[PDB]
Amino acid sequence: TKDQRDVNVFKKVLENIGNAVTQFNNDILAYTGGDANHLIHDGDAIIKATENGLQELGPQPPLSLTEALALVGPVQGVNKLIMKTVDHLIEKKGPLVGGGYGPQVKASLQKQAHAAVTLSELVSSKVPSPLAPISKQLSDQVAQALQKGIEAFSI
Numbered sequence: 134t135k136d137q138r139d140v141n142v143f144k145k146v147l148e149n150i151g152n153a154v155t156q157f158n159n160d161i162l163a164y165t166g167g168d169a170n171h172l173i174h175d176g177d178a179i180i181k182a183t184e185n186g187l188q189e190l191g192p193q194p195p196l197s198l199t200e201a202l203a204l205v206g207p208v209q210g211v212n213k214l215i216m217k218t219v220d221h222l223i224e225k226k227g228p229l230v231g232g233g234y235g236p237q238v239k240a241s242l243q244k245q246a247h248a249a250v251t252l253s254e255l256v257s258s259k260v261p262s263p264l265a266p267i268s269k270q271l272s273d274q275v276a277q278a279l280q281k282g283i284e285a286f287s288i
């Protein structure tokens with residue numbers, strides 16, 4: 134149906150972003166010190182998925198109420214993942230900063246955040262009024278999580 138096809142573009146974008154966050158999380162968990170370039174690369178892959186999502190969703194028409202409701206679960210999932218990943222990254226501040234990666238991690242998070250807020254506002258512009266409050270809450274979660282990271286890797 135057209136209804137499933139409509140939401141599927143949004144779902145695929147969220148899935149692609151979630152996959153990139155998951156890879157980043159896996160490598161953060163595995164990291165205890167030394168070379169962090171593959172980890173930094175993973176961070177930049179999240180930016181690319183977010184940029185691809187912006188490009189794919191830019192001109193999408195407004196979602197119906199039931200279409201937009203189908204995105205609540207997917208977004209809550211991605212958000213929980215982001216929150217946990219950032220927490221895990223902050224838990225590795227010692228070895229990252231110690232290995233000289235502090236500035237690069239901060240810069241990656243700032244760039245992630247700029248793309249994330251752009252996408253969160255774009256998706257929020259596609260949902261009808263009843264979802265405006267939850268869309269703001271979900272947008273704020275992402276922004277707040279990334280900001281928590283940026284602060285941790287500041288001096």
Ligand SMILES: CCCCCCCCCCCCCCCC(=O)O
Pocket residue numbers: 150154179180183201202204205208211215245246248249252253254256257260264267268271272275279
């Ligand atoms: C019905 C739901 C509407 C919600 C709209 C706002 C939330 C969209 C989520 C955007 C995901 C961007 C995540 C990038 C994370 C990162 O770079 O670390």
